[PDB]
From TrEMBL:
One of its GO terms (biological process) is carbohydrate metabolic process. Keywords: Glycosidase, Hydrolase. It comes from the Bacteria. One of its GO terms (cellular component) is beta-galactosidase complex. This is Glycoside hydrolase. Coiled coil: none annotated. InterPro entries: DUF5597 (IPR040719), GH (IPR017853), Glyco_hydro_42_N (IPR013529). SUPFAM superfamilies: (Trans)glycosidases. One of its GO terms (molecular function) is beta-galactosidase activity. Residues 45-189 form the Glycoside hydrolase family 42 N-terminal domain. It comes from Xanthomonas campestris pv. campestris (strain 8004). Residues 366-497 form the DUF5597 domain. The lineage of its organism: Bacteria, Pseudomonadati, Pseudomonadota, Gammaproteobacteria, Lysobacterales.
Length: 512
Protein backbone atom coordinates (compact mmCIF):
# COMPACT_ATOMS: atom_id res chain seq x y z
CA UNK A 1 0.00 0.00 0.00
CA UNK A 2 1.29 3.47 -0.92
CA UNK A 3 1.70 5.49 2.30
CA UNK A 4 0.00 8.88 2.74
CA UNK A 5 2.03 12.10 2.65
CA UNK A 6 4.05 12.71 5.80
CA UNK A 7 6.45 15.40 7.03
CA UNK A 8 9.57 13.92 8.69
CA UNK A 9 12.27 15.87 10.52
CA UNK A 10 15.06 14.44 12.68
CA UNK A 11 18.35 15.93 13.91
CA UNK A 12 18.21 18.85 11.47
CA UNK A 13 17.39 16.79 8.37
CA UNK A 14 13.96 16.99 6.74
CA UNK A 15 11.77 15.30 4.15
CA UNK A 16 8.33 15.81 2.74
CA UNK A 17 7.49 12.14 2.12
CA UNK A 18 5.15 11.64 -0.80
CA UNK A 19 4.25 8.06 -1.91
CA UNK A 20 6.90 6.78 0.47
CA UNK A 21 9.96 8.80 -0.56
CA UNK A 22 11.28 12.38 -0.29
CA UNK A 23 9.61 14.93 -2.61
CA UNK A 24 10.58 18.47 -3.57
CA UNK A 25 7.75 20.89 -4.33
CA UNK A 26 8.17 22.74 -7.62
CA UNK A 27 5.16 24.92 -7.10
CA UNK A 28 2.82 27.33 -8.81
CA UNK A 29 0.05 29.23 -7.08
CA UNK A 30 -2.99 30.45 -8.97
CA UNK A 31 -4.36 33.95 -8.36
CA UNK A 32 -6.61 34.59 -5.34
CA UNK A 33 -9.89 34.36 -7.29
CA UNK A 34 -9.05 31.31 -9.41
CA UNK A 35 -10.89 28.86 -7.19
CA UNK A 36 -14.12 28.16 -9.14
CA UNK A 37 -14.96 25.60 -11.86
CA UNK A 38 -15.82 28.36 -14.34
CA UNK A 39 -12.28 29.73 -14.42
CA UNK A 40 -10.22 26.51 -14.43
CA UNK A 41 -9.74 26.71 -18.21
CA UNK A 42 -7.56 29.78 -17.48
CA UNK A 43 -5.47 27.70 -15.07
CA UNK A 44 -4.56 24.39 -16.66
CA UNK A 45 -3.20 25.70 -19.99
CA UNK A 46 -0.77 27.91 -17.98
CA UNK A 47 0.29 24.90 -15.90
CA UNK A 48 0.83 22.92 -19.10
CA UNK A 49 3.56 25.40 -20.12
CA UNK A 50 5.00 25.98 -16.66
CA UNK A 51 5.15 22.31 -15.66
CA UNK A 52 5.01 22.57 -11.87
CA UNK A 53 4.81 19.26 -9.98
CA UNK A 54 2.50 20.89 -7.39
CA UNK A 55 -0.25 23.54 -7.66
CA UNK A 56 -1.47 25.71 -4.72
CA UNK A 57 -5.18 26.58 -4.90
CA UNK A 58 -7.38 28.47 -2.45
CA UNK A 59 -10.23 26.66 -0.75
CA UNK A 60 -12.41 29.45 0.67
CA UNK A 61 -14.44 29.13 3.83
CA UNK A 62 -17.13 31.28 2.10
CA UNK A 63 -17.43 28.69 -0.72
CA UNK A 64 -17.46 25.52 1.36
CA UNK A 65 -19.84 26.75 4.14
CA UNK A 66 -21.92 29.48 2.50
CA UNK A 67 -24.66 29.05 5.13
CA UNK A 68 -23.72 27.76 8.58
CA UNK A 69 -23.84 23.94 8.65
CA UNK A 70 -24.53 23.58 4.91
CA UNK A 71 -21.25 22.29 3.49
CA UNK A 72 -20.37 22.30 -0.21
CA UNK A 73 -17.10 20.61 -1.24
CA UNK A 74 -18.02 20.28 -4.93
CA UNK A 75 -15.10 22.52 -6.00
CA UNK A 76 -12.64 20.31 -4.09
CA UNK A 77 -14.01 17.30 -5.99
CA UNK A 78 -13.70 19.06 -9.36
CA UNK A 79 -10.20 20.34 -8.60
CA UNK A 80 -8.96 16.85 -7.52
CA UNK A 81 -10.23 15.31 -10.76
CA UNK A 82 -8.49 18.00 -12.84
CA UNK A 83 -5.19 17.82 -10.95
CA UNK A 84 -5.08 14.06 -11.61
CA UNK A 85 -5.91 14.58 -15.28
CA UNK A 86 -3.11 17.19 -15.59
CA UNK A 87 -0.67 15.13 -13.54
CA UNK A 88 0.07 17.50 -10.65
CA UNK A 89 -0.13 17.26 -6.88
CA UNK A 90 -2.01 19.86 -4.84
CA UNK A 91 -1.45 22.08 -1.81
CA UNK A 92 -4.80 23.47 -0.64
CA UNK A 93 -4.91 26.87 1.05
CA UNK A 94 -7.59 27.25 3.69
CA UNK A 95 -8.71 30.88 3.35
CA UNK A 96 -10.73 31.33 6.59
CA UNK A 97 -10.25 33.40 9.76
CA UNK A 98 -7.20 35.16 8.20
CA UNK A 99 -6.32 35.89 4.59
CA UNK A 100 -3.69 38.63 4.52
CA UNK A 101 -4.69 39.69 8.08
CA UNK A 102 -8.42 39.89 7.21
CA UNK A 103 -11.77 37.97 7.20
CA UNK A 104 -12.75 38.63 3.56
CA UNK A 105 -12.97 34.90 2.68
CA UNK A 106 -15.03 34.01 5.76
CA UNK A 107 -18.74 33.35 5.02
CA UNK A 108 -21.35 36.17 5.09
CA UNK A 109 -22.64 34.87 8.41
CA UNK A 110 -19.16 35.25 9.93
CA UNK A 111 -17.72 38.44 8.51
CA UNK A 112 -20.89 40.60 8.86
CA UNK A 113 -21.50 39.58 12.48
CA UNK A 114 -19.02 41.46 14.67
CA UNK A 115 -20.98 40.71 17.88
CA UNK A 116 -20.47 36.95 17.43
CA UNK A 117 -17.11 37.09 15.60
CA UNK A 118 -15.28 40.13 16.96
CA UNK A 119 -12.60 42.22 15.29
CA UNK A 120 -9.37 43.33 16.87
CA UNK A 121 -9.76 46.66 18.68
CA UNK A 122 -6.99 49.29 18.66
CA UNK A 123 -5.60 51.08 21.73
CA UNK A 124 -7.82 54.04 20.82
CA UNK A 125 -10.85 51.76 20.80
CA UNK A 126 -11.76 51.25 17.15
CA UNK A 127 -12.44 47.95 15.38
CA UNK A 128 -10.18 47.15 12.42
CA UNK A 129 -10.37 44.54 9.68
CA UNK A 130 -8.74 41.58 11.46
CA UNK A 131 -10.60 38.97 13.55
CA UNK A 132 -9.52 38.63 17.19
CA UNK A 133 -7.77 35.33 18.03
CA UNK A 134 -9.24 35.42 21.55
CA UNK A 135 -12.90 34.77 20.60
CA UNK A 136 -14.15 31.24 21.28
CA UNK A 137 -16.95 31.46 18.67
CA UNK A 138 -14.58 32.26 15.80
CA UNK A 139 -12.16 29.46 16.67
CA UNK A 140 -15.00 26.93 17.07
CA UNK A 141 -16.50 27.90 13.70
CA UNK A 142 -13.18 27.92 11.74
CA UNK A 143 -12.21 24.59 13.37
CA UNK A 144 -15.60 22.90 12.65
CA UNK A 145 -15.42 23.82 8.96
CA UNK A 146 -11.73 22.77 8.72
CA UNK A 147 -12.63 19.38 10.25
CA UNK A 148 -15.46 18.91 7.76
CA UNK A 149 -12.97 19.80 4.99
CA UNK A 150 -10.30 17.33 6.16
CA UNK A 151 -12.90 14.56 6.69
CA UNK A 152 -14.10 15.12 3.12
CA UNK A 153 -10.56 15.05 1.72
CA UNK A 154 -9.80 11.73 3.42
CA UNK A 155 -12.83 10.20 1.74
CA UNK A 156 -12.29 11.61 -1.76
CA UNK A 157 -8.49 11.56 -2.03
CA UNK A 158 -7.15 8.04 -1.37
CA UNK A 159 -4.77 8.76 -4.28
CA UNK A 160 -3.12 11.42 -2.13
CA UNK A 161 -3.29 14.08 -4.82
CA UNK A 162 -3.19 16.68 -2.01
CA UNK A 163 0.18 16.56 -0.21
CA UNK A 164 0.00 19.53 2.25
CA UNK A 165 -2.58 21.96 3.65
CA UNK A 166 -2.00 25.63 4.54
CA UNK A 167 -4.37 26.60 7.37
CA UNK A 168 -5.17 30.34 7.02
CA UNK A 169 -3.12 32.71 4.83
CA UNK A 170 -0.61 35.30 6.17
CA UNK A 171 -2.34 35.50 9.56
CA UNK A 172 -1.66 38.58 11.61
CA UNK A 173 -2.96 42.13 11.96
CA UNK A 174 -2.11 45.30 9.99
CA UNK A 175 -3.68 48.14 12.02
CA UNK A 176 -2.63 47.17 15.57
CA UNK A 177 0.26 45.37 17.32
CA UNK A 178 -2.31 43.32 19.24
CA UNK A 179 -5.98 43.26 20.32
CA UNK A 180 -6.66 45.86 23.05
CA UNK A 181 -10.25 44.77 23.70
CA UNK A 182 -11.17 44.00 27.32
CA UNK A 183 -11.19 40.28 26.35
CA UNK A 184 -7.59 40.54 25.10
CA UNK A 185 -6.42 42.81 27.93
CA UNK A 186 -7.61 40.32 30.55
CA UNK A 187 -5.38 37.63 29.04
CA UNK A 188 -2.46 40.01 28.56
CA UNK A 189 -2.64 40.94 32.25
CA UNK A 190 -2.51 37.25 33.14
CA UNK A 191 0.44 34.87 33.55
CA UNK A 192 2.55 33.75 30.61
CA UNK A 193 1.96 30.02 29.89
CA UNK A 194 4.64 27.65 31.21
CA UNK A 195 5.16 26.19 27.72
CA UNK A 196 6.39 29.50 26.41
CA UNK A 197 8.48 30.28 29.49
CA UNK A 198 10.27 26.96 29.03
CA UNK A 199 11.01 27.56 25.34
CA UNK A 200 12.45 31.02 25.91
CA UNK A 201 13.93 30.10 29.32
CA UNK A 202 12.09 32.92 31.10
CA UNK A 203 11.04 33.25 34.72
CA UNK A 204 7.30 33.40 35.62
CA UNK A 205 5.28 36.60 35.39
CA UNK A 206 2.59 38.47 33.46
CA UNK A 207 3.18 39.19 29.75
CA UNK A 208 4.36 42.73 30.50
CA UNK A 209 6.58 41.55 33.36
CA UNK A 210 8.27 38.85 31.33
CA UNK A 211 8.67 40.41 27.89
CA UNK A 212 8.66 44.16 28.54
CA UNK A 213 8.53 46.34 25.42
CA UNK A 214 8.07 43.27 23.22
CA UNK A 215 5.11 41.91 25.16
CA UNK A 216 2.39 43.19 22.79
CA UNK A 217 3.81 41.51 19.69
CA UNK A 218 4.90 38.31 21.43
CA UNK A 219 1.42 38.04 23.01
CA UNK A 220 -0.32 38.46 19.63
CA UNK A 221 2.02 35.95 17.95
CA UNK A 222 1.42 33.37 20.69
CA UNK A 223 -2.32 33.93 20.58
CA UNK A 224 -2.59 33.54 16.80
CA UNK A 225 -0.22 30.55 16.88
CA UNK A 226 -2.34 28.80 19.52
CA UNK A 227 -5.53 29.49 17.53
CA UNK A 228 -4.18 28.00 14.30
CA UNK A 229 -2.55 25.13 16.22
CA UNK A 230 -5.98 24.06 17.52
CA UNK A 231 -7.45 24.23 14.00
CA UNK A 232 -4.52 22.14 12.69
CA UNK A 233 -4.76 19.66 15.60
CA UNK A 234 -8.43 18.99 14.95
CA UNK A 235 -7.95 18.80 11.19
CA UNK A 236 -5.12 16.26 11.60
CA UNK A 237 -7.31 14.07 13.85
CA UNK A 238 -9.56 13.78 10.83
CA UNK A 239 -6.78 13.39 8.22
CA UNK A 240 -3.16 13.88 9.18
CA UNK A 241 -1.70 15.66 6.14
CA UNK A 242 1.36 17.90 6.65
CA UNK A 243 0.39 21.50 7.43
CA UNK A 244 2.25 24.81 7.36
CA UNK A 245 1.59 28.51 8.01
CA UNK A 246 2.89 31.27 5.68
CA UNK A 247 4.40 34.58 6.79
CA UNK A 248 4.17 38.09 5.42
CA UNK A 249 7.66 39.54 5.87
CA UNK A 250 8.33 42.87 7.60
CA UNK A 251 9.51 46.30 6.47
CA UNK A 252 12.10 46.43 3.65
CA UNK A 253 11.80 42.62 3.25
CA UNK A 254 8.25 43.20 2.01
CA UNK A 255 8.44 46.66 0.42
CA UNK A 256 5.62 46.24 -2.10
CA UNK A 257 2.70 45.19 0.16
CA UNK A 258 0.68 46.63 3.10
CA UNK A 259 1.56 43.43 5.00
CA UNK A 260 5.01 44.86 5.67
CA UNK A 261 3.38 46.45 8.75
CA UNK A 262 1.73 43.22 10.05
CA UNK A 263 1.92 42.04 13.67
CA UNK A 264 1.51 38.47 14.98
CA UNK A 265 2.42 36.28 11.99
CA UNK A 266 5.51 34.00 12.04
CA UNK A 267 8.08 36.66 11.21
CA UNK A 268 11.78 36.00 11.89
CA UNK A 269 11.64 37.64 15.32
CA UNK A 270 8.94 35.37 16.75
CA UNK A 271 9.80 31.98 15.20
CA UNK A 272 10.49 30.46 18.58
CA UNK A 273 7.19 31.79 19.95
CA UNK A 274 5.41 30.15 17.02
CA UNK A 275 7.27 26.83 17.49
CA UNK A 276 6.16 26.78 21.15
CA UNK A 277 2.57 27.69 20.21
CA UNK A 278 2.29 25.33 17.26
CA UNK A 279 3.41 21.68 17.72
CA UNK A 280 0.74 20.64 15.18
CA UNK A 281 2.12 23.06 12.54
CA UNK A 282 4.92 21.30 10.66
CA UNK A 283 6.82 24.29 9.31
CA UNK A 284 6.76 28.10 9.08
CA UNK A 285 7.07 29.29 5.46
CA UNK A 286 8.22 32.71 4.21
CA UNK A 287 6.50 34.60 1.36
CA UNK A 288 9.29 36.45 -0.43
CA UNK A 289 8.47 39.42 -2.65
CA UNK A 290 11.76 41.34 -2.73
CA UNK A 291 14.05 40.59 -5.69
CA UNK A 292 17.40 41.77 -4.26
CA UNK A 293 19.94 38.96 -3.86
CA UNK A 294 21.34 39.67 -0.39
CA UNK A 295 17.90 40.28 1.08
CA UNK A 296 16.32 37.22 -0.51
CA UNK A 297 19.16 34.90 0.55
CA UNK A 298 19.02 36.32 4.08
CA UNK A 299 15.34 35.34 4.35
CA UNK A 300 16.21 31.79 3.23
CA UNK A 301 18.93 31.58 5.90
CA UNK A 302 16.67 32.93 8.64
CA UNK A 303 13.80 30.49 7.95
CA UNK A 304 16.07 27.49 7.33
CA UNK A 305 16.63 26.11 10.86
CA UNK A 306 17.39 22.76 12.42
CA UNK A 307 13.75 22.80 13.66
CA UNK A 308 12.28 24.37 10.49
CA UNK A 309 12.38 22.95 6.98
CA UNK A 310 12.61 25.70 4.35
CA UNK A 311 9.52 26.01 2.11
CA UNK A 312 9.16 29.22 0.06
CA UNK A 313 5.38 29.23 -0.07
CA UNK A 314 5.10 32.29 -2.33
CA UNK A 315 7.48 34.39 -4.37
CA UNK A 316 7.27 36.89 -7.28
CA UNK A 317 6.71 35.95 -10.93
CA UNK A 318 8.97 38.52 -12.57
CA UNK A 319 11.89 36.91 -14.42
CA UNK A 320 14.48 37.97 -11.85
CA UNK A 321 12.73 35.74 -9.28
CA UNK A 322 13.09 32.44 -11.19
CA UNK A 323 16.71 31.77 -10.24
CA UNK A 324 16.00 31.75 -6.49
CA UNK A 325 14.53 28.24 -6.83
CA UNK A 326 18.03 26.76 -6.69
CA UNK A 327 19.46 28.39 -3.57
CA UNK A 328 16.10 27.58 -1.90
CA UNK A 329 16.47 23.88 -2.69
CA UNK A 330 20.08 24.16 -1.52
CA UNK A 331 18.83 24.65 2.04
CA UNK A 332 17.61 21.04 1.98
CA UNK A 333 14.01 21.89 2.87
CA UNK A 334 10.92 20.84 0.94
CA UNK A 335 10.58 23.24 -1.98
CA UNK A 336 9.65 26.55 -3.59
CA UNK A 337 6.58 28.00 -5.26
CA UNK A 338 5.93 31.02 -7.51
CA UNK A 339 2.81 33.16 -7.21
CA UNK A 340 0.37 34.46 -9.80
CA UNK A 341 0.64 31.71 -12.38
CA UNK A 342 -2.52 31.64 -14.51
CA UNK A 343 -4.08 33.19 -17.63
CA UNK A 344 -6.91 35.08 -15.84
CA UNK A 345 -5.34 38.35 -17.08
CA UNK A 346 -4.78 39.70 -13.60
CA UNK A 347 -1.45 41.41 -12.68
CA UNK A 348 0.05 42.13 -9.27
CA UNK A 349 2.60 44.46 -10.93
CA UNK A 350 4.71 46.25 -9.60
CA UNK A 351 5.19 43.25 -7.27
CA UNK A 352 4.94 40.75 -10.12
CA UNK A 353 4.79 40.42 -13.92
CA UNK A 354 2.61 42.72 -16.03
CA UNK A 355 1.52 39.82 -18.21
CA UNK A 356 1.48 36.08 -17.72
CA UNK A 357 1.77 34.26 -21.00
CA UNK A 358 3.63 31.46 -22.69
CA UNK A 359 6.69 33.69 -23.14
CA UNK A 360 6.94 35.16 -19.63
CA UNK A 361 6.51 31.68 -18.10
CA UNK A 362 9.63 30.42 -19.92
CA UNK A 363 12.32 31.33 -17.32
CA UNK A 364 10.32 29.59 -14.56
CA UNK A 365 9.42 26.56 -16.70
CA UNK A 366 13.09 25.86 -17.41
CA UNK A 367 14.02 25.45 -13.73
CA UNK A 368 11.03 23.25 -13.07
CA UNK A 369 11.97 21.11 -16.08
CA UNK A 370 15.60 20.73 -14.95
CA UNK A 371 14.79 19.64 -11.41
CA UNK A 372 11.99 17.39 -12.71
CA UNK A 373 14.55 15.46 -14.81
CA UNK A 374 15.98 14.22 -11.53
CA UNK A 375 13.46 15.12 -8.87
CA UNK A 376 13.41 12.00 -6.68
CA UNK A 377 17.22 11.65 -6.48
CA UNK A 378 17.43 15.43 -5.85
CA UNK A 379 14.83 15.09 -3.09
CA UNK A 380 16.73 12.15 -1.60
CA UNK A 381 19.89 14.27 -1.55
CA UNK A 382 18.01 17.09 0.22
CA UNK A 383 16.77 14.60 2.84
CA UNK A 384 20.42 13.72 3.51
CA UNK A 385 21.58 17.37 3.57
CA UNK A 386 23.53 16.79 0.33
CA UNK A 387 21.80 19.19 -2.09
CA UNK A 388 23.65 22.40 -3.03
CA UNK A 389 22.12 25.30 -4.95
CA UNK A 390 23.18 28.82 -5.86
CA UNK A 391 21.97 31.77 -7.92
CA UNK A 392 23.77 34.69 -9.56
CA UNK A 393 24.44 37.88 -7.57
CA UNK A 394 24.75 41.07 -9.66
CA UNK A 395 28.35 42.29 -9.69
CA UNK A 396 29.74 38.90 -8.64
CA UNK A 397 30.60 36.70 -11.59
CA UNK A 398 32.20 33.88 -9.56
CA UNK A 399 31.01 31.73 -6.65
CA UNK A 400 32.67 28.82 -4.82
CA UNK A 401 30.73 25.80 -3.49
CA UNK A 402 32.25 23.31 -1.11
CA UNK A 403 30.75 19.92 -1.75
CA UNK A 404 32.71 17.38 0.32
CA UNK A 405 36.22 16.58 1.61
CA UNK A 406 37.37 15.68 -1.90
CA UNK A 407 35.72 18.13 -4.32
CA UNK A 408 34.50 21.70 -4.67
CA UNK A 409 32.83 23.63 -7.49
CA UNK A 410 33.64 26.96 -9.06
CA UNK A 411 30.49 28.64 -10.37
CA UNK A 412 31.10 31.15 -13.19
CA UNK A 413 28.44 33.35 -14.82
CA UNK A 414 28.29 34.89 -18.29
CA UNK A 415 31.40 33.25 -19.80
CA UNK A 416 31.56 31.36 -23.13
CA UNK A 417 31.29 27.57 -23.30
CA UNK A 418 34.86 27.63 -24.53
CA UNK A 419 38.31 28.99 -23.64
CA UNK A 420 38.14 32.75 -23.12
CA UNK A 421 40.42 35.68 -22.31
CA UNK A 422 39.72 38.30 -19.67
CA UNK A 423 37.54 38.58 -16.59
CA UNK A 424 34.23 36.75 -16.15
CA UNK A 425 31.68 39.50 -16.93
CA UNK A 426 28.57 38.02 -15.32
CA UNK A 427 25.38 37.65 -17.32
CA UNK A 428 23.96 40.97 -18.59
CA UNK A 429 21.17 40.64 -16.01
CA UNK A 430 21.56 38.28 -13.03
CA UNK A 431 19.91 35.12 -14.42
CA UNK A 432 22.32 32.26 -13.70
CA UNK A 433 21.91 29.38 -11.24
CA UNK A 434 23.21 25.87 -10.48
CA UNK A 435 22.10 22.77 -8.56
CA UNK A 436 24.49 20.03 -7.41
CA UNK A 437 23.58 16.87 -5.48
CA UNK A 438 26.17 14.63 -3.86
CA UNK A 439 25.31 11.06 -4.84
CA UNK A 440 28.60 9.60 -3.60
CA UNK A 441 32.07 10.84 -2.63
CA UNK A 442 33.01 11.00 -6.34
CA UNK A 443 29.59 11.33 -7.95
CA UNK A 444 27.41 14.42 -8.43
CA UNK A 445 24.15 15.32 -10.17
CA UNK A 446 24.54 18.71 -11.82
CA UNK A 447 22.22 21.05 -13.67
CA UNK A 448 21.88 24.78 -14.18
CA UNK A 449 21.36 27.63 -16.60
CA UNK A 450 23.48 30.57 -17.86
CA UNK A 451 26.36 29.13 -15.90
CA UNK A 452 29.64 27.21 -15.93
CA UNK A 453 30.23 24.57 -13.24
CA UNK A 454 33.90 23.67 -12.76
CA UNK A 455 34.46 20.80 -10.34
CA UNK A 456 37.96 20.82 -8.87
CA UNK A 457 39.99 19.22 -6.06
CA UNK A 458 39.26 20.30 -2.48
CA UNK A 459 42.38 18.48 -1.19
CA UNK A 460 45.88 17.44 -2.26
CA UNK A 461 44.53 13.89 -2.33
CA UNK A 462 42.36 14.68 -5.36
CA UNK A 463 44.89 16.84 -7.26
CA UNK A 464 45.14 14.54 -10.31
CA UNK A 465 41.51 15.02 -11.30
CA UNK A 466 39.91 13.25 -14.28
CA UNK A 467 36.32 12.97 -15.48
CA UNK A 468 35.37 9.29 -15.36
CA UNK A 469 31.88 9.95 -16.81
CA UNK A 470 29.82 13.06 -17.59
CA UNK A 471 26.52 11.45 -18.50
CA UNK A 472 23.68 13.49 -19.96
CA UNK A 473 20.37 11.76 -19.23
CA UNK A 474 17.35 11.74 -16.95
CA UNK A 475 15.58 9.67 -14.33
CA UNK A 476 12.41 7.68 -14.78
CA UNK A 477 11.53 7.66 -11.08
CA UNK A 478 14.75 6.38 -9.52
CA UNK A 479 16.08 4.80 -12.74
CA UNK A 480 18.86 6.57 -14.64
CA UNK A 481 18.43 6.74 -18.43
CA UNK A 482 21.69 7.46 -20.31
CA UNK A 483 21.68 9.69 -23.43
CA UNK A 484 25.38 10.49 -24.03
CA UNK A 485 28.80 11.03 -22.44
CA UNK A 486 30.14 14.59 -22.55
CA UNK A 487 33.88 14.84 -23.28
CA UNK A 488 36.32 16.96 -25.36
CA UNK A 489 35.15 20.59 -25.88
CA UNK A 490 32.19 19.88 -23.60
CA UNK A 491 34.37 19.10 -20.54
CA UNK A 492 37.54 21.09 -21.29
CA UNK A 493 36.21 24.27 -19.65
CA UNK A 494 34.06 22.99 -16.80
CA UNK A 495 30.57 21.97 -17.82
CA UNK A 496 28.52 24.78 -19.38
CA UNK A 497 24.76 25.36 -19.42
CA UNK A 498 22.87 27.93 -21.50
CA UNK A 499 19.11 27.27 -21.45
CA UNK A 500 18.74 23.70 -22.76
CA UNK A 501 16.98 21.07 -20.65
CA UNK A 502 20.04 19.10 -19.53
CA UNK A 503 20.84 17.02 -16.48
CA UNK A 504 24.35 15.57 -15.91
CA UNK A 505 25.42 12.66 -13.71
CA UNK A 506 29.12 13.15 -13.19
CA UNK A 507 31.62 10.64 -11.85
CA UNK A 508 35.09 11.91 -10.99
CA UNK A 509 38.36 9.92 -10.83
CA UNK A 510 42.08 10.50 -10.32
CA UNK A 511 45.06 9.09 -12.10
CA UNK A 512 47.40 6.96 -10.09
Amino acid sequence: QTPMPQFVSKDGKHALMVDGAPFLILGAQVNNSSNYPGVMDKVWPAMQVLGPNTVQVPIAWEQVEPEEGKFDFSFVDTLLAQAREHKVRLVLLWFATWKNNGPAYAPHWVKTDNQRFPRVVTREGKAIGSLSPHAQATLDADRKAFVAFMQHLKQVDPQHTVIMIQPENEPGTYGSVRDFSPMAQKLFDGPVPDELLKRLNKQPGSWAQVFGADADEIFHAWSIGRYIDQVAEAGKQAYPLPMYVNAALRGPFNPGQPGQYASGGPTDNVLDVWKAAGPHIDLLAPDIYMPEYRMYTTVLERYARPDNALFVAETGNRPEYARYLFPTLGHDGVGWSAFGMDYTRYSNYPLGAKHVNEETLAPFALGFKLVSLGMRPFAKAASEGKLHGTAEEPGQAVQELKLNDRWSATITYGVPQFWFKGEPPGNPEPIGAALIAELGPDEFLVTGYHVRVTLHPASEATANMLYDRVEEGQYDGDTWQFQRNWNGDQTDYGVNFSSAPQLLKIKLATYN
